[PDB]
Amino acid sequence: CTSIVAQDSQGRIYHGRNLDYPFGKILRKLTADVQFIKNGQIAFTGTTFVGYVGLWTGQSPHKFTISGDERDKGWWWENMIAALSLGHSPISWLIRKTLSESESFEAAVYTLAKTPLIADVYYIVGGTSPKEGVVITRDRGGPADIWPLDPLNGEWFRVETNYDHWKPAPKVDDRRTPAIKALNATGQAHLNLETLFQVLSLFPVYNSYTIYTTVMSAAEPDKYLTMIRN
Amino acid sequence: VPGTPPLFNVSLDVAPEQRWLPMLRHYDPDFLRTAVAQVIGDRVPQWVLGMVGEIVSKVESFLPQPFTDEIRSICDSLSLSLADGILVNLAYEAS
Numbered sequence: 442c443t444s445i446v447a448q449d450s451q452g453r454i455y456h457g458r459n460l461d462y463p464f465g466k467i468l469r470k471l472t473a474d475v476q477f478i479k480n481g482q483i484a485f486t487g488t489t490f491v492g493y494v495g496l497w498t499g500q501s502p503h504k505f506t507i508s509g510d511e512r513d514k515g516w517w518w519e520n521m522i523a524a525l526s527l528g529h530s531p532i533s534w535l536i537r538k539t540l541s542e543s544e545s546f547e548a549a550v551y552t553l554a555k556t557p558l559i560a561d562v563y564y565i566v567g568g569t570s571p572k573e574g575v576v577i578t579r580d581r582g583g584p585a586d587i588w589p590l591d592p593l594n595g596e597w598f599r600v601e602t603n604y605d606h607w608k609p610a611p612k613v614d615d616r617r618t619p620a621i622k623a624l625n626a627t628g629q630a631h632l633n634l635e636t637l638f639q640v641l642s643l644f645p646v647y648n649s650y651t652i653y654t655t656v657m658s659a660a661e662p663d664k665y666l667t668m669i670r671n
Numbered sequence: 672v673p674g675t676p677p678l679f680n681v682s683l684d685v686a687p688e689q690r691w692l693p694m695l696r697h698y699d700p701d702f703l704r705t706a707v708a709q710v711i712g713d714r715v716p717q718w719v720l721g722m723v724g725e726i727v728s729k730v731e732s733f734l735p736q737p738f739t740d741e742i743r744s745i746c747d748s749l750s751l752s753l754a755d756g757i758l759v760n761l762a763y764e765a766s
């Protein structure tokens with residue numbers, strides 16, 4: 442997985458992600474965009490697989506966007522059997538619940554940071570106002586790290602793949618550095634959904650495991666776009 | 672348009688055990704069944720399948736009823752065990 446949240450020079454927030462999954466020639470046929478309806482209105486939009494009730498990707502229009510990336514320190518399944526049985530939430534169920542209920546980017550960040558989880562994860566959240574982008578590195582009990590955008594100091598994008606951002610990416614699976622270089626070469630002044638989509642189309646950010654690419658912007662919810670790959 | 676996934680409406684005002692069925696009606700159950708078996712096959716190590724009954728137990732008691740109610744309606748629609756529905760919905764929490 443790769444998730445990117447970024448701010449252009451005028452303060453607009455953009456959010457994109459690739460969902461990678463091994464042995465996924467089948468999941469491509471089961472990928473679907475879902476509009477979740479409340480009171481005859483589109484409450485939030487996500488992308489999922491048929492039969493999967495949580496969301497790894499979605500937007501609350503005019504409020505925030507969310508994507509999750511898998512985080513593995515080993516023994517996931519073992520630790521998730523242990524973690525389930527105490528009222529903790531599945532990763533993608535929390536995303537869906539947050540899209541449904543949270544009133545603001547601020548509120549979503551707190552919920553995604555603090556709600557106990559059955560597994561570790563990275564949550565990437567974008568809002569509608571300047572600086573409203575964050576990578577939340579989650580332990581099961583709470584946040585290991587909160588990493589917001591800081592354009593004031595020249596840090597106008599955050600890239601997350603599947604590794605802790607304060608550690609180097611492993612040389613055998615370094616999709617982070619090519620994404621950073623591609624964003625660097627795009628420039629803050631040329632960031633938009635189209636150029637973000639292109640960054641997410643670069644090998645190995647886009648690779649043989651990539652099921653779909655989504656780009657989205659809470660401030661422009663009608664531009665939500667998922668492209669099934671391969 | 673081209674290359675985008677199908678678009679579905681899912682109503683949260685419809686009951687949890689009904690709100691996914693319209694979407695499911697667009698897919699061949701045999702196809703979905705084999706897809707579920709695949710994912711469970713190459714994502715759920717066999718030691719996990721051994722205690723899968725345990726996993727069903729905790730979810731029903733410790734996971735929110737819509738989650739479980741939605742999943743059981745999918746399993747009954749596709750002739751899957753509840754265990755398989757929960758497993759495939761927990762198969763993604765990591766690699």
Ligand SMILES: *[C@@H]1O[C@H](CO)[C@@H](O)[C@H](O)[C@H]1NC(C)=O
Pocket residue numbers: 476478481482483678679680
């Ligand atoms: C979803 O439902 C809303 C309101 O009920 C409607 O505006 C829209 O046309 C529906 N979309 C689809 C794809 O069915």
Ligand SMILES: *[C@@H]1O[C@H](CO)[C@@H](O)[C@H](O)[C@H]1NC(C)=O
Pocket residue numbers: 618621622625
């Ligand atoms: C990206 O650009 C910044 C300066 O804008 C530089 O400090 C950094 O090393 C660059 N990163 C890569 C991976 O090229």
Ligand SMILES: [Cl-]
Pocket residue numbers: 537538541683
């Ligand atoms: Cl919900």
Ligand SMILES: [Cl-]
Pocket residue numbers: 600601602603604605606610617
């Ligand atoms: Cl990373």
Ligand SMILES: [Cl-]
Pocket residue numbers: 603604605608
């Ligand atoms: Cl790491």
Ligand SMILES: [Cl-]
Pocket residue numbers: 633634635
């Ligand atoms: Cl744009």
Ligand SMILES: [Cl-]
Pocket residue numbers: 697698699702
């Ligand atoms: Cl089908």
